[model samples]
Target: PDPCYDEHGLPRRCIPDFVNSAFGKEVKVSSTCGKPPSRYCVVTEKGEEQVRSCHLCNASDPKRAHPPSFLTDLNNPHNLTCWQSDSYVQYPHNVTLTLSLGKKFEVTYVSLQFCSPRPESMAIYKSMDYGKTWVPFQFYSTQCRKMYNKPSRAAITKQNEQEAICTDSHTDVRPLSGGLIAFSTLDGRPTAHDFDNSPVLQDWVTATDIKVTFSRLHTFDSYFYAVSDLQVGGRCKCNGHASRCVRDRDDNLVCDCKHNTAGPECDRCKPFHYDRPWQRATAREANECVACNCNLHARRCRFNMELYKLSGRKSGGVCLNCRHNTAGRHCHYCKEGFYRDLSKPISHRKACKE
Candidate 1:
């Protein structure tokens, strides 16, 4: 595979499809409607028909279907199979569906394809710290002010673009079936065009978990949420240091980190590559991690903030357990009993001798 930087020293950024990160991964549903093979009725173009169950046997008497897992399965949205929740009665009801991406991801959009009539009120939430705390991403309701106490489709400004807004655009139940509600994280944002330079916009689009909540159903015979497919469109959060993401041996998705960066998300610099402070990549700079200049006498180094300040923020790497009769912050000087060999180059392994 190609590196994250091109031959001309330009950064080659990678943004993968959002669904690619959620596909085949585990999804948590508040409720699945096939515990004892419960049946539900659907109004179709022909007529109202009752199905055997939410999850039908793929091969009769061979294996039972799993409805919760179907939420993230690879299937056409037209397929009848879906994750169905228990029926709700009134306006205060709530059913949730959650997806954990195994790691942080730079999410672009989150879309839900409904098998039943779309709910009268819904909200999308995201978590940056692996579901520790969730913040609202967007809201949908026919009466936004009445339910959420916010005006529908309110415009956002540069000062508060990260704030979520209630909108009635996707709350219509007229589509009846296969209603798709797509939420773009950057849509209508003030700093979307200069996304690379905006920390607020960048942080706003990163998430470790995505959750969808269905609340308040339109006055209809069927009062349940049925999602045929849930698509999360984004890529692994590599912090602009990796071009590929792969599953590790433990079956956890991780970034194939480049640019001397480490960690599943390429969030930090490698031990030997901490000559400078770690910074996220940008269009103008790859922010590549730099290796410590150890003069071939040290195998490891650590970043020292004070040293960095002392050197006018140039290099902060401090060599550890210096070898080859060399000792110093960068393994640049001979030890007490050793002498420097003037005949050899400064980077030679034996430049410092007994």
Candidate 2:
């Protein structure tokens, strides 16, 4: 029960998959403030090594076991997200996100970050042996506007569900995660909530795979189902060899992985590698630690945070940290004062002359 500080101390939290996408899942944090919070806010990180992994796309998430032409894209701030500007998957209104964990994960909750083409209605369901079976996980009914914890709705009407998803939720149901993560309405009269006690998640029931169906099927102007983010939590699967896992000074997963290396495993490269590509701590690959191509001018490429911000971090890492009057992605250009003799290659030492 400590700060669980990261080496950078930037405050890395196991937040939900998406924060900006709009839909039933998306609710403005209410002021008690009636700002309105979603069941998602309840999802938090339990103490484990600093390393956390999502079932979806990450650096080395083994080729997804469940594959399809589906999935709009995977989020990484840098590099091309699996995005299609013109087209979104046309799922007949309901979208199912299924996970393929090699083993059962003691997962307590699942969160989906999506923009509502139809914030009409939605519900969550779970299955252990894939599609062999599915049972109610939770549901969104015209019952709660805040998208707080509500009763689980089995197969039912969509328009009614839509009314619920688009309603204005004002209560703080986030506390429901303490039980199982569900919600209620704002009037506070029918304040009663589901499994509302406290910390109802049982390890035996925690699992790996789940499916989330949203909004129901409908013909609409915007026929697109897009998911900006997703996250699966709980100690269902242990990462790195617990015995081999290292710790920081206070002892947890090691806070810092030296510099170039990443996570408790010290395998992948930290964010911003040109050739190797900066990876999240959970990446299965190793960061080869490529030297920044700084035209042999300045020190290593300044970790290009700006580039990281722009282009969704497509060209992350060092943004060509060139000096000696040079610039360019590969440090292949000369700045104002720096002259260039077109005779040789563009690498400045030859092409660039004072």
Candidate 3:
């Protein structure tokens, strides 16, 4: 018998209640990817010998009725659904699911499989009241590696242009905020190279093994927050090695590192590029590290000297020379556009000539 919830709506096991009996203990329920025949399990008080069990519920059980009005079932074969119809769209290769934690709780994780050769996207929604009105929680895009196969090329070109706009490697949202979010390729094409009918082309280029977690507050006094993580599992575009090609995990990009490194492989760092702390002590410190030298332009010297002091020697290296366009203690000054030779040295800061 499934240890999760049953068709009758009765929990197969009362372990959740028993575990929640203690503070900080979590009662976790996980559902599998795909439609009607999906399954779920629960674990209490996580540990090596922790009591773990699950309950398999029938997908059609009316008791499992999705949050009315807020969630819409998709036409795809997967058992996934969405919170809003017009707001969310999952590719045939991607799965969409919505979760509700009653009025007192909000969802934190959204896990699913990405079994399509095409990249996958996800958006989250929330409701202050029980499904009365829904709003986006956040959105994300994944699977941004360039492809080198011709069939994959044809497949991407065939996708709707609107669905292909998120292939860029940049993120536009704040680091930690929950609001409306969406993901799609930018041009309906892989960001990598194209390959002919090679042996690797027949392999599946999809994402599987997904997991999402959510954070909640006990009361209105507490704050609600959410963070997102992405992973890509497949063959390395470089060396054709089978491994996990994920992003921003353990402060290291899996398989593939951006901004340098080459070969049919991931994990090879760029020449002379080592991962080190890239932090700044203050606004002025950040400007200096990027070669701004705030001394060139008087206007750029707005930052106080104290900020530079705090940056420490690593980032707050001395700024002995300023750009021709800047001149100030913090390199904040810029001569009038026509008054100075921007290409000349600070010694040439003289009146403009026709």
Candidate 4:
């Protein structure tokens, strides 16, 4: 009947003196013992230390509390980097970001973890209108085969007689439209070998850091996201091969191809003439231009060459005509006493025959 002194045998030390007099003053006492089934002692003061023991209604062990789902860790701070592909292929990829947040979010689910020779075969893509537009998610390939199903030559001769075990795992949730999640290499094709085969292009390869949570049907009034990873490839060296690197509106990273493929890697232009008029005139230049001509008057004018070298402006000085009355090789026309007046303001001119 001594249950650590409750029916008053005095020495529970009044529960650390009611917790140091309800946390307002002094209390000190340390160590005491009474072994087997029911007996305890341990208390120290000056800041308070407790281990006072007493248990008998079968002795305690039960506590539960919950409320946070879908990869919940809402402290909200994330970073992700990835790469893979040694003899596997796939190339030219990037995902970058710098972030800050406190409240306003709607990132449903994004998970990336890869260390594969073939981790069940990974595949993921999301741009959310920020990367211009991309959406594709389905990854599970460690040679298990099922990217739509079709593998039997004895599974392609046992995939070269076994040895393709790069390991694998998969997890991807549906709801996602949040901002800033840039990383590319799934390849369906827009050109440039669809990023060369994508496994992040292989070269050491490592990328893991993605956490997003917000679901109540994801209604947002505020949410901030970030991205970073400037250059990857396929033709985006800041303009030269003609242009095919897009991200500018302020997202920065210019070079937008058109004009038969100009330079920074639009590859090459002019045979029948391509690279049309691809807009986005200026944010200070990444790539965009046209001025090419070879047929209006046989005079042989060609500005911005590569239209196969337009030869007649003066017998192959490489064709760049349009001067006498100025007519469009980007000379833009109308100067002989002024005549282009569709309704005024073609830079305004209308004198013609005078």
Highest-lDDT candidate: 1
Q: Model 2: what TM-score?
A: 0.31
Find the 10 residues in a row with the least total lDDT in model 2.
29-38
Q: In candidate 3, what are the lDDT values of residues 37-87, reduced to their tens digit?
A: 334333334444644454443435644332222122222444443221111
**Tens-digit lDDT track for model 2 on 267-342?**
3554443434544322232223344655566554545666756757455555445655567776677766768767
Give the whole-model CA lDDT for all candidates, comma-separated: 0.76, 0.37, 0.28, 0.26
Off by over 4 Å in 2: 1-74, 77-94, 143-200, 203-205, 215-220, 237-354
Q: Which portions of model 3 show Cα errors greater than 4 Å? A: 1-155, 158-191, 194-289, 294-354
Indicate the worst ten consecutive residues by lDDT in candidate 4: 13-22
Error of 4 at 182 (Å): 14
TM-score of each: 0.85, 0.31, 0.19, 0.23
User: What is candidate 1's lDDT per residue for 175-280, written digit by digit as tens?
Assistant: 6678888889999988799888888988999888888777786785445677776778787788887776788896888888777878888789877988878788
The best-first sequence of candidates by TM-score reads: 1, 2, 4, 3
The better candidate by TM-score, 1 or 3, is 1
Better of 2 and 3 by lDDT: 2
